Every structure is written in C-alpha cells, then in structure tokens.
Amino acid sequence: TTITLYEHDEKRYRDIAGDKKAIQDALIKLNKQFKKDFKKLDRSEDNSDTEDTIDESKGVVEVYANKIKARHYVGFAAVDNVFLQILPKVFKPKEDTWEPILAFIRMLDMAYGLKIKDHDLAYLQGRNLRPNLYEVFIYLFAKSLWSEVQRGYHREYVEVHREEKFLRGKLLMSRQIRKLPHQLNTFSVEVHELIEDNLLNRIFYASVREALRRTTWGLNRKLLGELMLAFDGITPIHLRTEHFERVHFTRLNERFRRPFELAKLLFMEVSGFFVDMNKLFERFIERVLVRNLPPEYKLFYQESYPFSSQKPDYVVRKGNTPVVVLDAKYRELKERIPSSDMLRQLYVYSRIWPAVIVIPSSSTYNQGLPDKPLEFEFFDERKLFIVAYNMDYVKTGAIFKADKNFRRSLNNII
Amino acid sequence: TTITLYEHDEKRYRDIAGDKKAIQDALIKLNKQFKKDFKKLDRSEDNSDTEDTIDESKGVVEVYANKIKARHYVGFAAVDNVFLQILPKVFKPKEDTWEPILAFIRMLDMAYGLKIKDHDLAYLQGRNLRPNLYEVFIYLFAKSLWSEVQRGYHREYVEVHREEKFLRGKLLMSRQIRKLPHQLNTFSVEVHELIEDNLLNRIFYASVREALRRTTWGLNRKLLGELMLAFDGITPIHLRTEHFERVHFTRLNERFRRPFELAKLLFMEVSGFFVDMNKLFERFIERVLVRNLPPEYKLFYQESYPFSSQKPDYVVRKGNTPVVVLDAKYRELKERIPSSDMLRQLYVYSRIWPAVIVIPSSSTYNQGLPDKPLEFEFFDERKLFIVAYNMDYVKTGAIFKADKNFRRSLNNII
Amino acid sequence: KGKEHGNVFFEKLRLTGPNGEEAYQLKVLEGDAFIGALKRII
Amino acid sequence: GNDNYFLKTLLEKINVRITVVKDRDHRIGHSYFLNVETVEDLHHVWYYEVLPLLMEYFYNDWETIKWVLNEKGKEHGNVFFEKLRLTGPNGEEAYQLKVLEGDAFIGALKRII
C-alpha cells in the first residue's frame, strides 16, 4: 500500500488502503529506526525532546488509535510494502499529486546541496506515472548513473604482481632471477591492468541490485535492468557503511559523484531518509538571501551566547556595522501576528546583536498569505523594527518570478 | 479497571489490567469530552494548540499503538469502568501510592481555592484503602455534607397560597371574602412553611444518588447510604447545569458552600475534572510568595504588552519602583541551566519591566534538585540578574518546613 | 498476470513472507495442459 | 511423537519458508538428515550442519531466520535463538543461538511443524 502525508496532516484508518494492522506494524519499526539514526541530521529550533518523544513511537509519525498524524519531518520511507512519503504542507493543493513532488525535490535541490538537473525532473512531468518519492530518487540515481556509464565505464587501474603465462607490463626482476628452472615457464610480472570491478563498481552493482528488487515503476525497471546488464561481470557485494567510506573522489572518478551521493542517500530493513522541515526552509532561504542581498554579505549560523547559546538562523552585516537579524521560521503565522514563542526569540536575537530583525515565512495557496509588500512592522517598546517578510513560492514551477518580488521587498527593507 | 498515570509517564498495554480494547475505547471518549469542555479552564504558557492537538485524541491522554502516555494535565476522570487518575510527576516516589494522593489534594487545596480540612484527609491516612482520586473527592463531598446535615437539615422557607382544612399562618382576606358559602369549609391562607425539599436539597439528593451508584469504597458506600436515608422524603431531580446556577448562597445556607462546590466539581457519561499542571503550580507558588514576601507586595497576572501581550506569572513591586519578575515554570530544568524556551521568555519579562527575574521550580526526590541556596545566577549581557530558585516540597507531609527555607533564600534574593 | 495456481508457468506459493512479499515458482506441465498453457500466450 | 511423516514435513515447512524470504537456490538439502539414527544424532545435525547454514545465509538479520523457524515473537525459552538482554549504543537486537538438549529440543522442533 502507498500512503502519503503532508506536514501536520492526518489520515483515517477506515478510508486507508490495505489492512489496519499492517500500517501500524510498519510505523513502529520506522519510528524506532528514526530513534537510532536521529543524531545524524541537524536541526534548527526543532524542540525535538530527544529523550522522551522520539522513543515513544512519535519520532516521524504519530500513530494513534483512530488516525495517523505526521510530525514536521519531511521526506519519505519504505517499510514492509507500506511506502510512506511526507511532503511539506506549503506545497499542498486546494497528476493531482504530481506538482508537490517536483516542488519538494527542487526545494531539496537548492537547500540540501544536491546537484541534480532540471531536465531530469522535467522528463517525468506529464507521463502519468504514480507519484512516489522512492520511485523518483531511484530514477534520479539510475538516470544519472546510466548517463555517466554510457560515456565511460570507470575502469580504474590497480597493479597486481601476477604470474602470467604471457608477458604484460613491467617484468619483476627480483622475482624472476630467483625463479628455479623447473618453474621458468611462467613470467612473473607486475602489470598495471585496468579492472572493471573496482570498489565504485561493486557499490553500483549492489546499489542497483537493491534498487531493482524494491522498485515499482515501469520506467525504473527498464533503466535498472540495463544498468544491471552493463555490470554483469562484477562480483556482487553486501552493502555496508564501510564500503561507502572506503572510496575517495579523485579526478578520474569525479563524474561519478552525482550517482554515488544519491546511492549513499538511499542505501547503507528501512530505506530512504528524513530531514527536518524547519532546517530545510532555513537552508532554502539562505540560498535566496545571499543571491538577493548584494549590498550586505550574509552568514548563516552566526552565534552570540547569552548569559546556553541562542543563535539566529541567519544574520546579514555589511562589514560589521549593520545588525539585521533574519530568523527563518516554518510557522504559519496565523492572524497576521507572530506567536508567543516566535516574538520572544525575535526580541533576544535583536538585543544581543539598535538592530532590526526580519522573519521570513512561507506563502502559497495552502499557507497563510499576507499582502505583497512587507506586511507587518512591529516595535517592541525599545525602538525595535520587526518586519514580517513573506516569500512567495513559484518553486512548484521552474521559473523564479517571486525572487524578483522578494528582492523588491528586501530593497525597501534594506 | 483502575489505571494511574503520572505527568509525562507511560504504561504498557501488555502489563495493564482489563482488556487492551477496553481502555482505548475509554480514552477516545475522554479526549473528545475534553475538547468540548476545554475553554472552561484557564492556562498559563501551556502551548495548547487548541485547533489541532486536542481534537486528534491527544487532549488529556496520548493513546498510542504500544503504550499510553499522559500529557501535562493533572486530575482524574472515570469513564466506562476505566478510572483514570493523573498525579503530578513531582510527587512520584522512587500505601505505596497513598502519599502522592494527599500531596496532590493539598496542592489542590491551597492553589485552586478549596476550603477542605486537613483532618478530613488525615482520617484516611493509614486505613489501607485503595488509592483513587474519585473515591476521596466523593468522600470529601460526603463527609463535609454529613457534617453539615447532622447539625441542621437546611429547611428553607417558601410561602404558598394554599387552601388548607386548618388555619396556618396569615389568612388571605381578598381570597376569603370572595369565597362562596358553598365552599366555605376550607380556609385560604398564605403560610410561610419551611420545606425540607428545597432546591439545594434536591441537588444534594441527586448528587448523592449519582455518587452511590458510582462509588467503589466501603467507607463512601456507608456514608452516602446514610445521606440518602436522611434525604428520603425529597423528590429526586435530573441534575443539569441550570440547577447548579439557580441556587444562590445567602447567609442562611452559607454553611452548605463546602459540599456544594465539591458537588459542582464532580457533577453537572464523563465524571471528574482536569486542570493544567503549569497553572496549578503558578497558583500554588502565588500562595507561597505573598505569604513569604512582607517587604514587597506581589500581584499575579500583571500584564505589559510588547509591540500579542506577554505577561509574567507573578511580579512583586514595593510600591512601584522595584521590578522583580517571578515567572513560575513547571519544567524540570535539566543540566542546571534553563532551556531555550524558558530563558527567551525570561529576557522579555525583565526588559519590558534594570529588572531582576527569579524563576521558581519544583524540587523533590523525583524532580531535579539543586543545592539549598539560590542555585544559579545568570547575566544576559545586559546587566541582568536571573536567579534560579527552587522550592522544596514538604507538602507530601502536613508541616511547612520548606517555607522557612524558601523565605531564607528569598531574603538573600531581596 | 492475473492468474495463479492453474495452468500457469509461474504459480504463486501459498505462504507469503514476513513483510508481505510473495515468491513464485516455476511449474512443469505436460500433455494438453501445456498446449492449453501455450494457446493463451497468443 | 509417533510421526512417520515428520522429517518430510520438517524440511518442507523450512524450505517453503526459505524460498519466500530468500531465493529458491538457498534451501536446506536432504543429505544432512540422511544419517540420523538417534535424537542425539539429529541434535548434532540440526546444530552443527543445518543451523550454521541458516546463520550463514541470514547474516545481520535475526528476524527473518526467526520466521523461517516460525518462532517469531517467542524469546528466552525453548528457542533456537534466545534474545540477549542488552540493547547496544543505538539499539540492536543481536540474538544468540541456544544449545538445547533432550526432550526440550524436541519440544522446540515440534513447533517448527
């Protein structure tokens, strides 16, 4: 069964496909698996409460008696033929669930640091496939591999001190001089032969073999079927985490960086990955600000310690003199005013940095939308200047029209 | 089945008594009943999130697939023969569960404004009864009623214009002059007779009848059995919320204030009540501060609006000049330092009020305990003075030894 | 695709795995059952 | 237990649970049980010649081998892989095999059928 969630959204167990007992068995393994692998991913003002909440089967999904509720952890996971995918709530609409997939991967393209191509994703737009995050990241792995295997096969050179019936390469002399004449019929050479089954090819044969076994599309089954035939002579391996560390990216296999990072993102039971929606917006806004703020340079994660260090998500300073704090919040900001938890942190970030502070918030049809300019000016009775900026999201499309509107509102703010 | 929780504590469904399906049916009615009756009780920095969390069957109890987890809502409820009681986590021990009951009711005595007696609770100490919050608040209702019915029965005066075969009271003259001589054989009087079945006695007959039906002790069954015999002539009523409003407390039934408020606390399906553990500590510390702060008068809930008003739990000012903010937090305060959410609010409360700020926290064997004096002095790089005060709890006993230690630490703070 | 346990070249085993997986098995046929299994490939 | 069809249905209830969690080419053969003469010989065959193959085919995976023996959820008893009490740094199951003997071993082999 395929189940899909948006951030802070619920599904009924009666309407859902499959079995009632089957889905709740899949989740308790996933929330437990998120507990052991929680510390690998960074957060930003998450209020995670690592001791109590995550180990109570509330790590990724809150499984309840009457419904199934998603926390603010975005991504996907495939467990026990119950494929779960959690999209952001910002891309929620009012092919009907194919626009938020390419919106989320493009927000996973710019924020998280991936180097995927837009024409890789635009190939899938309109082919009426079943929307699934695991079916597209296997495709993004398989297409970027088959576009990097079609040119060259990555045959890397190792040297072997082999006793050959012929003579290839440099003849070892200290091993041939001390050769008895009863065994003179084989040369003892040290040939730098190119092997096809290197460590990077043992991984990509194993990463395809664990992908074709767990794929469900009709496009990925054809593409991984051609990749497995190209890797036919390679002896297979069992994938571990030691194999993904033992290879290093030099200049002769640098073009295999794009399929390998996606092969490390999906393989290392469980499959997939999860990230916090607060930090992914904190990373995504950081791409927008430094591009859109020419007058003043901006650094993310600068920290100033009170008295326990409370650090802003981003601060922009021209040289050192202007202190314009920019704290990225994923909150909906209901009733056109910041909440108690938000404005209390905005007060501290301005005071310990005469410092204006701007809060960027999400804006679409689903999320709360303010007017086009800088919506809310606030003073906290200390000559402060709190500006509520809102970035519109044309990221569901491929054109960046809202970046010009975000620059025009920031130019009036700067 | 009797199930008991502490605040933020979990129980396993396999170890629990009764049936697995029976308890989860009882909770989904209780969390739904808490949704419709949520707005009657006040909060203080609760982060309730009224729209999403409470209606998702997470109002009082978080019912999960593998366990049952309590939120920070203290009290009790009896639903479908699954009696739930949630005690505070501060009274958790390392007759074994009879000390935290009398600790919680005494904290419900001083904070919430009840006027129960200590010798009402000390009668039950050591009688090896089964610990239950509904069995003691029915007892506190039944003993305070039977101690106020044994003296006087509350026979209140109503006047009736009745045609009596005898002559009692004032004879109505305009109704007797116009009486035809074929019906002269009955006087027409207006007698101020005392009736035993007044509205306050119809309630107490109905409040006992709905208590003896739902009691489980052997002491309350004897006490309510004597109360129901004393109210034998009273015609019963169906209890509503209009009946508890239609009576008013004058001087002639003022001694029935103590059983009636407890009869309104338990009766109005569901039974019992719940209150937020944050506000109940915010109310309980307010009794301690005004008693322990002679030099400066202290007012609770004073508000100052930034820019959305962030108000302290308590502020003490001598006249108007010293601003010593006292914000009560129920947090455990791990690692001897305040958290991000706590210290961010402490910074705002001091700045909008040169103002020192003191945070009181709970301290027992279960909760985190600091040293005896004022444990943590902090400055937030603006010449601030954040003092972490801790009140020890001898409230499990009947003697207030820690109030002298709280006064000595406050005298060094003042 | 929508046939199992009959005159099929790959019949499903009647015991699924722990995570809901299914494993098929090659099935030998003979006589007119095999010809009837070839006459529905066309 | 006076069952003439016992060792036939022992490998059949193993192999049809082997071929659905692994390949068909990873099954347990029948040359190991062709020399059993007493229960002690079957105790040696099941512990030194068959269960080493199941630990070899299922490495770092203790749940699927617990379903091949259809003893899932049952630990700390007459189980061929008892659960170790310890959890680990992040939390692993990490079972350990248990050498049974006597009628208790047959009481653990009867419920594989």
Residue numbers in the entry:
A (entry chain G), B (entry chain N): 5 to 98, 107 to 280, 290 to 328, 335 to 380, 393 to 453
C (entry chain F): 543 to 584
D (entry chain A): 472 to 584
Give verbatim lines from the article.
McrBC is a two-component MDRS that in Escherichia coli (Ec) restricts phage DNA and foreign DNA containing methylated cytosines. Biochemical data suggest that stimulated GTP hydrolysis powers DNA translocation, allowing EcMcrBC complexes bound to distant RMC sites to interact and induce cleavage on both strands. Here, we present cryo-EM structures of an McrB hexamer and McrBC complexes from the evolutionarily distant archaeal species Thermococcus gammatolerans (Tg) and the well-characterized E. coli system.
To overcome this limitation, we produced complexes containing full-length TgMcrC bound to the AAA+ domain of TgMcrB (TgMcrBAAAC) in the presence of GTPγS. This assembly was structurally more homogeneous and allowed us to calculate maps of the “half”-complex at 3.7-Å resolution, as well as a C2-symmetrized map of the entire TgMcrBAAAC tetradecameric complex at 4.2-Å resolution. A TgMcrC dimer bridges two TgMcrBAAA hexamers in this structure, with the scaffold and nuclease domains forming the dimer interface. The nuclease domains associate through their α12 helices and a loop between the β10 and β11 strands (“L”), whereas the neighboring scaffold domains interact with each other through their β4 strands that form main-chain hydrogen bonds with each other. Structural superposition confirms TgMcrC’s C terminus shares the same fold and identifies Asp340TgMcrC, Asp354TgMcrC, and Lys356TgMcrC as putative catalytic side chains based on their spatial alignment with the EndoMS metal-binding residues. TgMcrC’s scaffold domain and the α12 nuclease helices collide with the DNA substrate. We therefore speculate that our dimeric McrBC structures depict a conformation that is incompatible with DNA cleavage, and that a major conformational change would be required for nuclease activity to proceed unencumbered. In support of this notion, we find GDP at the A/B site in our EcMcrBC structure, the F/A site in the structure of the TgMcrBC complex, and at both sites in the structure of the TgMcrBAAAC complex.
